[PDB]
Symmetry: C4
Subunit: 206 residues, 4 copies
């Protein structure tokens, strides 16, 4: 749990995310809870040139290390950490199916039992606000109150979990659920879903 071990894993999550097909338009950013703030990916540097020393520390006050530029989307990473104390890692991306559902401004309903992985019977969609603003941060903090992942309208996805492995896994799972919802929505609307009682049993079970 040294700084450089946490920097290496951030980078491996960047690479793994690209290999899985979630980082298209070379748009993601990844962070971990650390000391009084977080370690996050820098802005501008392509994932493949990233080295341990590129990773930036941002404290609880929002001040970042000297001579390093944190991701341009860092504020809602900080908002996730303060809204969900149990979150230790955050994955953000512009994965295509998720972003496509976020353009319809729809929530993803319980079309598969794996929806319970993010905490309830849906995957919310928070309202649009200009990227990088205080207003975007508030909507994300309210959406993550009772869910571990949220879509952001006209934008993409945020997923948070106890470690980087699980956070990437969740992010990927939401992209599968997003693709299943768009695939069936083109055939029939609305899409058949499992009932709230059925989702309650699955939740107990997990």
């Amino acid at each position: 749990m040294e700084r450089n071990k946490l920097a290496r894993q951030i980078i491996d999550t960047c690479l793994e995310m690209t290999r899985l097909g979630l980082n298209q338009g070379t748009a993601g950013n990844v962070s971990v809870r650390y000391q009084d703030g977080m370690l996050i990916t820098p802005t501008g540097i392509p994932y493949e040139k990233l080295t341990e020393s590129h990773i930036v520390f941002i404290d609880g006050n929002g001040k970042h290390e000297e001579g390093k530029l944190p991701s341009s989307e860092w504020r809602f990473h900080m908002a996730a950490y303060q809204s969900r104390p149990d979150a230790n890692a955050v994955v953000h991306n512009h994965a295509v199916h998720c972003t496509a559902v976020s353009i319809l401004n729809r929530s993803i309903p319980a079309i598969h039992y794996m929806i319970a992985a993010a905490g309830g019977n849906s995957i919310p969609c928070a309202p649009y606000a200009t990227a990088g603003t205080r207003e975007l941060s508030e909507h994300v903090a309210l959406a993550l109150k009772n869910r571990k992942a949220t879509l952001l309208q006209h934008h993409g996805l945020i997923a948070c979990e106890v470690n980087l492995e699980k956070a990437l896994w969740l992010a990927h799972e939401v992209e599968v659920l997003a693709q299943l919802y768009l695939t069936t929505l083109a055939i029939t609307d609305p899409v058949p879903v499992l009932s709230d009682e059925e989702i309650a049993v699955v939740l107990e079970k997990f």
Copy 2:
């Protein structure tokens, strides 16, 4: 036909299945008929860390080896083995197109002559029941009576065959048929199919 040769092939089937794009949401599980029960993948361990010694033996009574946790979906692997005596290997996954057809709760009709690979003129869709229950197991055992593969509503796919090679091959084939059905269903409904007599000739031919 030693235990470790069967453990190696299970693992290679996991890897091959991931490479083919069927194991998204890192959800599949694979088993083989062995002695009085089966060898199956364990729960929790990511496919890439899997070693021969991770594979779990579950006997005819449903008791598993000490200190090892079998997949959480093991019961319907045991149900497949008792419903189809000729089955020696089982592949389960949550492949996207198959799962998308299973959310519409539709059977896949004879839209391509390769539908005959699973035994008849369709790929059934068994009714939803909570994952891991006795009730899910019964529906799978009834669906596999006269078919080698079945969709599971709101869930995914199960495919069984005489060996791991053929079972993976079948599972993959059903994912192609699922994608062909969803692609054409978005254009026209219903989709044109081959007649029962035409399917009967193909069956004789195979």
Copy 3:
């Protein structure tokens, strides 16, 4: 232009075709014109285990070498060679988009100027006939009279050209055109096409 150089290239075309995503359901077969008949891939052996000595020779009379089983789809490879004297190589596959258009039993119209690569202003779709029969062979020979590639209803694609490189390239191009047609057909029907005069200029130009 030795037998084993032609066997090596067939195999490399199998591999390249799989890498491109055209050989799903491990269904393709490839042949080259040779002596009085052709060299073709064998039936049963998975592409990755294929060695030079697996390749089968079939003469002008349809007799194959002793102890080797040619692809189960060899007859329409022989039909292509007799219908188009200029063809030296044949690629057959069950590529998804192409097969999906072939289930709608539609021709692909001039939605892109690259349609001219197969000879005219369309990609025909020959009528279904049981795989491996004389009747399937006749429909393919009539469809290839004035086109270098054809869809086969409820089945897949056949493409022929002067060498293996160009034949694979053509096969791949038709799969792109098939995907473009299905993608736009789900939005609007009919799809806008280029006029016959415009296609005539492109043809002169190529």
Copy 4:
């Protein structure tokens, strides 16, 4: 900034573009501003056999080096360079989603805040004209007046930027936006977009 360093990067952009899935039907071509004209990929040679010495120089008058055949699509590369003085690199391809939007003859509207990367609130679609003609060149030069990327009806995409890295990145981004637009258009028409004022804030911000 030697000739061979610019030739190496063109080639790496070809390869990277293929790896990303934008060069299907082996149709792209890439160029860089150089001396009084440009260096561009040659016609006929498959990307993978390309060596530094294959790259062709075309001067300001449109004369190319002796014994080398420039891409068959070179004229609109020259048109981009004269229409946008700030452009140092050009990427052209027939990427599927982009080409599919270009067959509907539609512009891509502001469905995502990343639309601002090409300069405004849309991605235009220039009218069809036979490939390789003076008329195609004029339409591309008018479309690129106030945008860094344009679709070409019934054809594909052109993207230009200050260097090869950014030009490929832009080209890829437009393919993501194209896929998001076609995915949502199949569900609802019209697709919800961000307002012109909202796009103006994003532009200031970038």
